[PDB]
């Protein structure tokens, strides 16, 4: 009998004041929250943010919406959400969010006989995540999502995770292109501003960057160019043209690698770890060419000393490069 | 009792004329303003602007909304804000703004018995900041936000910072990777247009750019290449192939560095400090190649003159580069 359901719904909404929360002037309303993560698209280091799509479910109780005689849960058209009181939940660290609206407003209202309201949304949000890139690309990040009440302090509304640690689902299924999700954490607390104390829920993820791509792409070309730079020590010191060509062309190659790897890497202007490694490699090829300068200047009158300098360089340059690598890979890893 | 509150609010809104400001036709209405800065997400030299997220709070008194019998500050739903009078505040130098709207519109209305309205918004605004980049990357910027009344002159409305110099808070929440806030300032004044005189508030920040990245990434490669070009003066002048290769490849390396730095750095179409430094280094390596060309020309018939020119170059070039660096780093710092 649709007429009975229609008259029950009309009765519930007749005299209903949406401007007043449930139990207005009484104890606070407790709102439970669930999230189903569907994707995490682009963890950006240039803008320091990430995009997240989720099903955001809110649960509360409103006695004004309690109905009897209908042994069912009333799933209503989502437009009826405009005729009720819903919590003023907002994401405190979002930069641009929307609720999907194709083919209709991706929104769900389900009423239970006792007045329990389930309210669901499907939301894509860009959220800020400040990143410490001082160990890039060997870095680990922690990205959060903050959930708060914009208007109601703790005297009116309360938040909690529905299901405890089972509240947020779908995290294990996420597969980021450049990171891996190590652990996610749920926190409930209170936060005090000059306007009062508000409830806060916090969902955090810890991400570890994958390094094999950078090992194959960023470090090995520089290592190979540096190793190629030492070939100059095994050429005779009287061969000026060959050794100068080798040194200056290795310097040019190292410069090309640096200038075209700055563009590939994120354009956030401050120092990192890969920057230090590349500068070390540049200094090494520069020093090899300088060593040839010394040898060429000395060898005319003192051939034995020049041969000795070349023979010692053949050992000193690889040894010092190994020491530099040891210090670097112990300081950052 | 929900009914008494509902009828009180209905009475307050009944017979309320939204088209008229408080004390219409009488003394001006005074609006107090607070800003709580969530972040400064981006500063752009290409587009000459900056993005700012804030909590913007306005305070005023409307006697038509004074109510008695309920000794509570009524925190109403955000939708009720559509039924009242609010100041027509705008930002003169903003290009793109919005009020956050997930899950609901990030808006707050709170009322007090004496008719005092507290009205809060959460706003992301891109604001134009005209930057003098002639000293880039050693530059210091000043970025402002201008708050004005669009329709009401000084006869109708008056602005003030609520709390004096404590009106704007959260300045320490700003984390710009390449800048660093030096100082923020609050200003209150009036602005005259052909239509009349309007109140104006101004919030300004002073930004100091971080130089370390540019020293590691832009100045050291050029310095090392310029130094490398002096290796030619220590190579015997009979070695034409070696010295010619060194000179021309240093010129090519400098050209590659400059052309790739043009793409990597933000596109600011006029001459800055970094352009002057790079042009100076290019001139230096060009002069080194020219010196060798002269030496090679005259060395066949006047070996003494060629040797003297080499010996004097070995001192003149490092000394002149030191002087150029001294003048540059004293003028721009």
């Amino acid at each position: 009998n649709m007429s009975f359901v229609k008259e029950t719904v009309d009765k519930l909404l007749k005299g209903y004041d949406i401007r007043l929360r449930p139990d207005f002037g009484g104890p606070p309303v407790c709102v439970g929250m669930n999230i189903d993560i569907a994707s995490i698209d682009m963890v950006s280091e240039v803008n320091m943010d990430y995009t997240l799509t989720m099903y955001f479910q809110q649960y509360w109780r409103d006695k004004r919406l309690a109905y009897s005689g209908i042994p069912l849960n009333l799933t209503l058209d989502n437009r009826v959400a405009d005729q009720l009181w819903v919590p003023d939940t907002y994401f405190l660290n979002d930069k641009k969010s929307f609720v999907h609206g194709v083919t209709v407003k991706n929104r769900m209202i389900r009423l239970h006989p006792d007045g329990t309201v389930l309210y669901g949304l499907r939301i894509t949000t860009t959220a800020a995540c400040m990143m410490d890139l001082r160990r890039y690309p060997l870095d680990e990040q922690n990205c959060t999502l903050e959930i708060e009440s914009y208007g109601y302090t703790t005297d009116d509304i309360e938040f909690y995770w529905r299901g405890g640690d089972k509240a947020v689902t779908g995290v294990e299924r996420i597969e980021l292109p450049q990171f891996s999700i190590v652990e996610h954490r749920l926190v409930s607390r209170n936060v005090v501003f000059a306007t009062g104390a508000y409830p806060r829920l916090s969902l955090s993820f810890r991400l570890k960057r994958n390094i094999g791509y950078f090992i194959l792409q960023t470090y090995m070309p520089s290592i190979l160019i540096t190793i190629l730079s030492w070939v100059s020590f095994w050429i005779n010191y009287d061969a000026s043209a060959a050794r100068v060509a080798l040194g200056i062309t290795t310097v040019l190659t190292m410069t090309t690698i640096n200038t075209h790897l700055r563009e590939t890497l994120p354009k956030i202007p401050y120092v990192k770890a890969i920057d230090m490694y590349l500068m070390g490699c540049f200094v090494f090829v520069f020093l090899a060419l300088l060593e040839y300068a010394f040898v060429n200047y000395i060898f005319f009158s003192q051939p034995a000393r020049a041969a000795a300098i070349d023979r010692w360089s053949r050992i000193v340059f690889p040894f010092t490069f190994s020491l530099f690598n040891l210090v670097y890979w112990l300081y950052y890893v | 009792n929900m009914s008494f509150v509902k009828e009180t609010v209905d009475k307050l809104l009944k017979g309320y004329d939204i088209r008229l400001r408080p004390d219409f036709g009488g003394p001006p209405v005074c609006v107090g303003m607070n800003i709580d800065i969530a972040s400064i997400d981006m500063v752009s030299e290409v587009n000459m602007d900056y993005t700012l997220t804030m909590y913007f709070q306005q305070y005023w008194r409307d006697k038509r909304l004074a109510y008695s019998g309920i000794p509570l500050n009524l925190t109403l739903d955000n939708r009720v804000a559509d039924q009242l009078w609010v100041p027509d505040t705008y930002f003169l130098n903003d290009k793109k703004s919005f009020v956050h709207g997930v899950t609901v519109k990030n808006r707050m209305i709170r009322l007090h018995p004496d008719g005092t309205v507290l009205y809060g918004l959460r706003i992301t605004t891109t604001a134009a900041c005209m930057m003098d980049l002639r000293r880039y990357p050693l530059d210091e910027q000043n970025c402002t936000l201008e708050i004005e009344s669009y329709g009401y002159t000084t006869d109708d409305i008056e602005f003030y910072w609520r709390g004096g110099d404590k009106a704007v808070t959260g300045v320490e929440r700003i984390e710009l990777p390449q800048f660093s806030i030096v100082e923020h300032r609050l200003v209150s004044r009036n602005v005259v247009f052909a239509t009349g005189a309007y109140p104006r508030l101004s919030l300004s920040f002073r930004l100091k750019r971080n130089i370390g990245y540019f020293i590691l990434q832009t100045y050291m490669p050029s310095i090392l290449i310029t130094i490398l070009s002096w290796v030619s003066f220590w190579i015997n002048y009979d070695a034409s192939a070696a010295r010619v290769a060194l000179g021309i490849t240093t010129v090519l390396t400098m050209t590659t560095i400059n052309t790739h730095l043009r793409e990597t750095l933000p596109k600011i179409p006029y001459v800055k400090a970094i352009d002057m430094y790079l042009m100076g280094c290019f001139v230096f390596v060009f002069l080194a190649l020219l010196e060798y060309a002269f030496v090679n020309y005259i060395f066949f018939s006047q070996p003494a003159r060629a040797a003297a020119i080499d010996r004097w170059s070995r001192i003149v070039f490092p000394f002149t580069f030191s002087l150029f660096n001294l003048v540059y780093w004293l003028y721009y710092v």
Partner: nanobody, 105 residues
Framework: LRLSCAASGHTFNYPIMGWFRQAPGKEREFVGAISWSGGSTSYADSVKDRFTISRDNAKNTVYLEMNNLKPEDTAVYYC??????????????????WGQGTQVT
């Protein structure tokens, strides 16, 4: 007189350090706050021009120098760390990790 607060660990999730003082007959009072990174500083109204807060990130140290001490400063001092989205700056509840007490008279 001078105090120094040194922090170790995930000092990037807690970019703000704050000083508080506790009086026997009152509640805890905010004194000052310094950002680990940008170096911006905030002070209480009654400690301006007398106490000063600085920071050196080299050893992860934040310093509070105290000048012109007065008898109303007899309180046990604490240094605390505040998260990035933890709210207002003047409220001790917003601060997660607290240091040990210190008597100054």
């Amino acid at each position: 007189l001078r105090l120094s607060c040194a922090a170790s660990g995930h000092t990037f999730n807690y970019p703000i350090m704050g000083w508080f003082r506790q009086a026997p007959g009152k509640e805890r009072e905010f004194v000052g706050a310094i950002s680990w990174s940008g170096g911006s500083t905030s002070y209480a109204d009654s400690v301006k021009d007398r106490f000063t807060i600085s920071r050196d990130n080299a050893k992860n140290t934040v310093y509070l120098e105290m000048n012109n001490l007065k008898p109303e400063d007899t309180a046990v001092y604490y240094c605390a760390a505040k998260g990035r989205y933890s709210g207002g700056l003047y409220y001790p509840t917003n601060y997660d990790y607290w240091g040990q007490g210190t008597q100054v008279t």
